[PDB]
Design a protein that fits this description.
The protein is built from ten helices and ten strands. The chain is an alpha+beta fold and 270 residues long. It starts with a helix and ends in a 6-residue tail after the last helix.
Length: 270
């Protein structure tokens, strides 16, 4: 159960009459102010370090010339913590029509490239494969994988078996990551890219709690898979979309490497 009352106590503490309401997981909850201008993410006591980690990522990114939220407040008590941030105004890219996403496609490549050009050795944060693979081992050990996050064809397969398909390739993928590390967003699905509703450029990134060094495919795999849902029955475009993104961003496609991250990601949540 989501600790609604404890979380709303934190959010109400300043007396602003902000009309905080939940909008949307493992005890964490996201709230929005009535005017739409502020968001809050709250977590129970045992998740505070992960939320503090997110706070730090948002605040650091605000110094990096990459568009994203600002931290407005950080609140803690016995029942957990709340992270209050500014809204990144615009339309989440998963809500874009296919033609809108197409209008934003090169702008997204360019905005992601800029993020991925931050010098990775200067980033305070990591989401490298050894950490992520260790997180998946833990989720799988806890039998906590949500099969709805898996690719359709995997949803009826024991997650320990899915993990075991990836385990032999950790070394190879670590070598690729070492050779081509970037500062990844860390959860680069379409919902986390906000588009300007008039220009269809990128307004900013949200949900930065996994930001850090990683192979760029940790991001590109999720972006491409979630955009494939938008391209739908348009087979001519769905067959070309990724090649053109890659050409604009400046990377060679590597489908095995992409698929590895596509398949790892769902095992890491929960």
């Amino acid at each position: 159960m989501i600790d609604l009352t404890a979380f709303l106590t934190l959010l109400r503490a300043d007396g602003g009459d902000a009309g905080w309401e939940p909008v949307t997981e493992s005890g964490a909850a996201v709230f929005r102010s009535a005017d739409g201008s502020r968001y809050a993410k709250c977590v129970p006591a045992d998740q505070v370090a992960a939320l503090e980690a997110e706070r730090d990522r948002v605040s650091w990114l605000s110094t990096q010339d990459i568009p994203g939220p600002r931290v407005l407040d950080w609140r803690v008590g016995a029942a957990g913590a709340g992270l209050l941030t500014s809204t990144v105004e615009g339309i989440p890219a998963d809500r874009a029509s296919a033609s809108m996403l197409r209008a934003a496609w090169e702008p997204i490549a360019d905005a992601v490239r800029r993020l991925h050009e931050l010098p990775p050795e200067k980033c305070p944060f990591t989401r490298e494969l050894g950490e992520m693979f260790s997180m998946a081992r833990d989720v799988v050990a806890r039998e906590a994988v949500n099969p709805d996050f898996l690719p359709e064809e995997q949803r009826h397969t024991p997650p320990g078996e899915l993990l075991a398909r990836l385990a032999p390739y950790v070394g190879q993928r670590l070598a690729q990551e070492a050779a081509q590390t970037v500062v990844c967003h860390g959860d680069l699905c379409l919902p986390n890219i906000i588009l300007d509703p008039d220009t269809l450029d990128v307004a900013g990134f949200i949900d930065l709690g996994r930001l850090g060094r990683a192979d760029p495919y940790a991001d590109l795999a999720l972006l491409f898979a979630t955009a494939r849902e938008t391209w739908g029955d348009d087979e001519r475009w769905s067959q070309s979309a990724e090649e053109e993104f890659a050409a604009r961003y400046g990377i060679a496609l590597d489908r095995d490497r992409e698929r590895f991250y596509l398949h790892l990601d769902p095992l890491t949540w929960g």
